[PDB]
Amino acid sequence: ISGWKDATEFIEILARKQGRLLKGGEPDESGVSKQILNDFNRGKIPWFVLPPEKE
């Protein structure tokens, strides 16, 4: 999923496309956020701090 800004639309579109939602009918933003943080912790989404520049 893409096109998000401020990450609120990110969580909403992700909960909609993933099929996760609270009954009638709001998306479960908290549960999708849990999977987002779990993917960030497990390394499923690549990321790394920039190494310091060489002398």
Binding site: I1, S2, G3, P46
Partner: peptide
């Protein structure tokens, strides 16, 4: 400690690195 080439390692093929997926 001796020389140790880092190129023998193969980075994990994470889904976000592959070019097969794209948007827009």
């Amino acid at each position: 400690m001796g020389k140790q080439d880092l190129g023998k390692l193969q980075t994990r093929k994470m889904k976000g690195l592959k070019s097969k997926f794209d948007q827009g």
